């Protein structure tokens, strides 16, 4: 099934090559910004990244092999998680700042403008600091990001010939674990160090789920009281 035959080095290669581009914000000398304004940049940004995420997902080995319904469910569950780990990744070398775009580099005080954002901000920063302290490697990040796509929604599927899908997603997931271990052995880590590092990486995914949960809550809070049609749809999936 193509993805299962891939080698560890080919998986990395496939993932690195699948990477989306880094979009810029439409922030300008308009300085400064209000609650509305800052919110606009974030959502416009996320909206535009969503298009690229979808085409990136199609290139995640094993994703195409799934039904259109299952692909949809995966992205619906994962999109904000995927955006967030992206953000924290490119914010790694910017302690105390969140790099939404090369031209949009926010510190936590700017996050105060916009309610409840602070707390989400702090969590993203702490995650970024954690990645920094672990010296997260780029090849590890693409594995983690793919893992999120495949994992975050797999348990909200289901009977019938759907178990065939779940099993396929888990075979691919194992492949990616093999790939992470491979990257670690290559890096020279001992066996004990590999397992430990694997564990450390995956536990951070729980925190990333938590941030998406909260963020999704706030995003919904704010749309009740201008988000793109796509965003709104991606958001409705988390509210039955």
């Amino acid at each position: 099934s193509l993805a299962l035959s891939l080698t560890a080095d080919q998986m990395v290669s496939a993932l690195l090559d699948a990477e989306p581009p880094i979009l810029y914000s439409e922030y300008d000398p308009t300085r400064p910004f209000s609650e509305a304004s800052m919110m606009g940049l974030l959502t416009n940004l996320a909206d535009r990244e969503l298009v690229h995420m979808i085409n990136w997902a199609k290139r995640v080995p094993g994703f195409v092999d799934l039904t259109l319904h299952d692909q949809v469910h995966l992205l619906e569950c994962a999109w904000l998680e995927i955006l967030m780990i992206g953000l924290v990744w490119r914010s790694m070398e910017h302690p105390g700042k969140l790099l939404f775009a090369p031209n949009l580099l926010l510190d936590r005080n700017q996050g105060k403008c916009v309610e409840g954002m602070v707390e989400i901000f702090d969590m993203l920063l702490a995650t970024s600091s954690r990645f920094r302290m672990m010296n997260l490697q780029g090849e590890e990040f693409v594995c983690l990001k793919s893992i999120i796509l495949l994992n975050s929604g797999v348990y909200t599927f289901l009977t019938l010939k759907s178990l065939e899908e779940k099993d396929h997603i888990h075979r691919v997931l194992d492949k990616i674990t093999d790939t992470l271990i491979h990257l670690m052995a290559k890096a020279g880590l001992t066996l004990q160090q590999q397992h430990q590092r694997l564990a450390q990486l995956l536990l951070i995914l729980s925190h990333i789920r938590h941030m998406s949960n909260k963020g999704m809550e706030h995003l919904y809070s704010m749309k009740c009281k201008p988000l793109s049609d796509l965003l709104l749809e991606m958001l409705d999936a988390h509210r039955l």
């Binding site: 298009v51 199609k58 259109l68 949809v72 749809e233």
Partner: peptide, 9 residues
């Protein structure tokens, strides 16, 4: 859904 469309094309 829009997502359907983007996934198809």
């Amino acid at each position: 859904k829009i997502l359907h469309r983007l996934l198809q094309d």
